[PDB]
């Protein structure tokens, strides 16, 4: 019994965080086999942030301008290339603490664990949803870029996020580990702003359930559209309660009228996926 926001054990990812420096610009890197992955704006300077040409900036640089500290051990960089918004630095040593892993681009709604790093040192771990507007509500200061979001299924570490930047609102954008951004964001200090935020419908359902264990008026209230593959996923959780998916979908309306605590919260919580409930609750 008990239901809490819960990150994956960060151990297998901490083994992979190095430090990456180009000239005087520094941030975190992800050392896997003989390849360091890092946001590509490490090749920028303070004078150089507004409208940067990463392809000219990159051409000017050699292997020897990429400094990677992995603990004491300085890794010698023996190759460099750029895939969208991430650098790839080939190095002399494969990471001996490399876990089973694969990159994946997660959907909005889905959650991962964030290992906040600074100078290549894991500092803290928390649980994040990819919001509809393709932002996250993080805690990230200067030096935090190159910080990774991941999920652990088996002891396959599925990396789904690398961090780059914060927006004026107080929220955060980044890429999958192919350097492709979430949403329509770019790595430069021009005025960008997020889409307006919906609420993840399936996640507020999943959470409603979790309370017990301890249609589509949603356009009106800014709840994303619920789908068939969502009520097939939610299936296990409607079976466990006896309260069918549609049954639970009912309770939804007298709530968004005049809905003091539920599992501690006086708001519908949407930062928990149904898998995140199954794991914790009956799992």
């Amino acid at each position: 019994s008990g239901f809490r926001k819960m990150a994956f054990p960060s151990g297998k990812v901490e083994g992979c965080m190095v430090q990456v420096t180009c000239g005087t610009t520094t941030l975190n890197g992800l050392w896997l086999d003989d390849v360091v992955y890092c946001p590509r704006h490490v090749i920028c300077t303070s004078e150089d942030m507004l409208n940067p040409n990463y392809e000219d900036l990159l051409i000017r640089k050699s292997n020897h301008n990429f400094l990677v500290q992995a603990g004491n051990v300085q890794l010698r960089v023996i190759g460099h290339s750029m895939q969208n918004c991430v650098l790839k630095l080939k190095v002399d040593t494969a990471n001996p603490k490399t876990p089973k892993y694969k990159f994946v681009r997660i959907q909005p709604g889905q959650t991962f664990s964030v290992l906040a790093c600074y100078n290549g040192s894991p500092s803290g771990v928390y649980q994040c949803a990819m919001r509809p507007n393709f932002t996250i509500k993080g805690s990230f200061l200067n030096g935090s870029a190159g910080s990774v979001g991941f999920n652990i299924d088996y002891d396959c570490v599925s990396f789904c996020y690398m961090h780059h930047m914060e927006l004026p609102t107080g929220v955060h954008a980044g890429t999958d580990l192919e350097g492709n951004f979430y949403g329509p964001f770019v790595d430069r200090q021009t005025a960008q702003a997020a889409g307006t935020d919906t609420t993840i419908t399936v996640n507020v359902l999943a959470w409603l359930y979790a309370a017990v264990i301890n249609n589509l008026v949603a356009m009106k209230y800014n709840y994303e559209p619920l789908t068939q593959d969502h009520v097939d996923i939610l299936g296990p959780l409607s079976a466990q309660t006896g309260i069918a998916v549609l049954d639970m979908c009912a309770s939804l309306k007298e709530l968004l009228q005049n809905g003091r605590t539920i599992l501690g919260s006086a708001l519908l919580e949407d930062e928990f996926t149904p898998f995140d409930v199954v794991r914790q609750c009956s799992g």
């Binding site: 610009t25 520094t26 941030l27 490490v42 920028c44 930047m165 200090q189």
Partner: peptide, 8 residues
């Protein structure tokens, strides 16, 4: 709109 590396 801040890039969250450390610049010096």
């Amino acid at each position: 709109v801040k890039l969250q590396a450390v610049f010096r």
